[PDB]
Design a protein around this ligand. Structure first.
Ligand SMILES: OC[C@H]1O[C@H](O[C@H]2[C@@H](O)[C@H](O)[C@@H](CO)O[C@@H]2O)[C@@H](O)[C@@H](O)[C@@H]1O
Ligand SMILES: OC[C@H]1O[C@H](O[C@H]2[C@@H](O)[C@H](O)[C@@H](CO)O[C@@H]2O)[C@@H](O)[C@@H](O)[C@@H]1O
Ligand SMILES: OC[C@H]1O[C@H](O[C@H]2[C@@H](O)[C@H](O)[C@@H](CO)O[C@@H]2O)[C@@H](O)[C@@H](O)[C@@H]1O
Ligand SMILES: [Ca+2]
Ligand SMILES: [Ca+2]
Ligand SMILES: [Ca+2]
Ligand SMILES: [Ca+2]
Ligand SMILES: [Ca+2]
Ligand SMILES: [Ca+2]
Ligand SMILES: [Ca+2]
Ligand SMILES: [Ca+2]
Ligand SMILES: [Ca+2]
Lengths: 151, 151, 151
């Protein structure tokens, strides 16, 4: 009656929010965001050394891009191609050389290394970038690569 | 009194939600977006040729700015005025020389041609740009113009 | 009635909506935003003079950043440091010299002045900027500093 009518109204509000929010999400993701599954990649539009880009992500409430999938990597790669800038991933074998780990300290459930990589070139390459072709290369942490954080 | 305090719940949350979403809408629209009606113009902030720009928009789940009225053209000019870059529109007479149409193929319902426009200069100008003064000029689709999508 | 078949509905949506929005929050605030309480500071990412910038904010539905607590101030300081540009605050003493107020003509409830500030250098400094250390300074309103709106 008066409850029928006000739930019926609660109905319209929630539909209005889904359409509005839906169109808003599109707006947010253009042009510096990629959506794939339940994760979002977003670029900061610029480049920084690993430690500098790493802290950018953590405090924004997310973390460096950690594609655990060829699908996540291809989307991330869509972002890297776009800026025409190779980007850091979250992974680092700085604990123990030769074995790369996610920031929790876990081990890689997925990789997309480029031929010859990782080679720890110079005896000092413990971070990872992703190329415009989507493939991986371990590299020194002090190099400035595109900042892309996952959410 | 049960579902009374069950729907009074969702209602509360739906309300707090609408406030949040409302403040956040105005945050994304700053500074690279305009809201006019139910349409949302958003500029990337850089220039591209028509085809690259067109792709960008289609891929963000939208398309190139297609002002359909005074009010809409005015909102779009804002973005243009602000970036001091002439932007591209979706409209083309690539099919029938002299007949400009939206991507859907439909003929124009509004226009704002600059005095003496279009002129298909050089014997080839199939695309459209909006100036900082609002008026329209046709241009070669190879030109790099400001990218602005509509959602 | 059959209403309990429909509140079981609003429930799930509101749930899905709230979670989905909660993630785009972190998404949007990166890299140019910072929340603090229920206020958001958002940088336009460039520098303009007081008059021009205060308009970009007021036309975006907001206003020039008005930190009113040590917290709100610390948050704003975050942005300024990141972009490495001292930013304008909303407050001026153009009405009455030596007397700083908000756009509401209201008088300050928090300040974090640099030592010996404000000094109205050359008797021509009616505006406020905030340094990369969080400290305040009264500057020429004609000067161009970082644009940051509070929403
Ligand atoms: O910084 C120069 C060079 O560094 C990176 O790659 C280097 C090394 O990591 C690779 O193993 C070898 C062979 O693949 O090439 C470089 O020595 C990349 O950032 C690369 O793009 C860059 O030119
Ligand atoms: O790319 C050069 C020039 O192209 C466009 O305008 C040209 C033509 O379309 C106009 O009809 C004439 C008359 O003003 O001007 C040019 O010839 C514009 O995009 C223009 O800004 C640009 O310089
Ligand atoms: O652009 C010069 C200078 O202006 C501002 O500071 C000036 C004045 O307002 C200060 O009171 C004194 C003492 O700190 O310094 C200057 O004279 C600031 O905007 C400053 O960053 C700037 O370099
Ligand atoms: Ca090592
Ligand atoms: Ca290594
Ligand atoms: Ca290497
Ligand atoms: Ca033609
Ligand atoms: Ca033509
Ligand atoms: Ca022309
Ligand atoms: Ca004065
Ligand atoms: Ca003064
Ligand atoms: Ca001063």
């Amino acid at each position: 009656a008066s409850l029928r009518q006000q739930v019926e109204a609660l109905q319209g509000q929630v539909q209005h929010l889904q359409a509005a929010f839906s169109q808003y999400k599109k707006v947010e993701l253009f042009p510096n965001g990629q959506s794939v599954g339940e994760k979002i990649f977003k670029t900061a539009g610029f480049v920084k050394p690993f430690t500098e880009a790493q802290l950018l992500c953590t405090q924004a409430g997310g973390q460096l891009a950690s594609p655990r999938s060829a699908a996540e990597n291809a989307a991330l790669q869509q972002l890297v191609v776009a800026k025409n800038e190779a980007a850091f991933l979250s992974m680092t074998d700085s604990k123990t050389e030769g074995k790369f780990t996610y920031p929790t300290g876990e081990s890689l459930v997925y990789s997309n290394w480029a031929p010859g990589e990782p080679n720890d070139d110079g005896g000092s390459e413990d971070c990872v970038e992703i190329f415009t072709n989507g493939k991986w290369n371990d590299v020194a942490c002090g190099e400035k690569r595109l900042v892309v954080c996952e959410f």
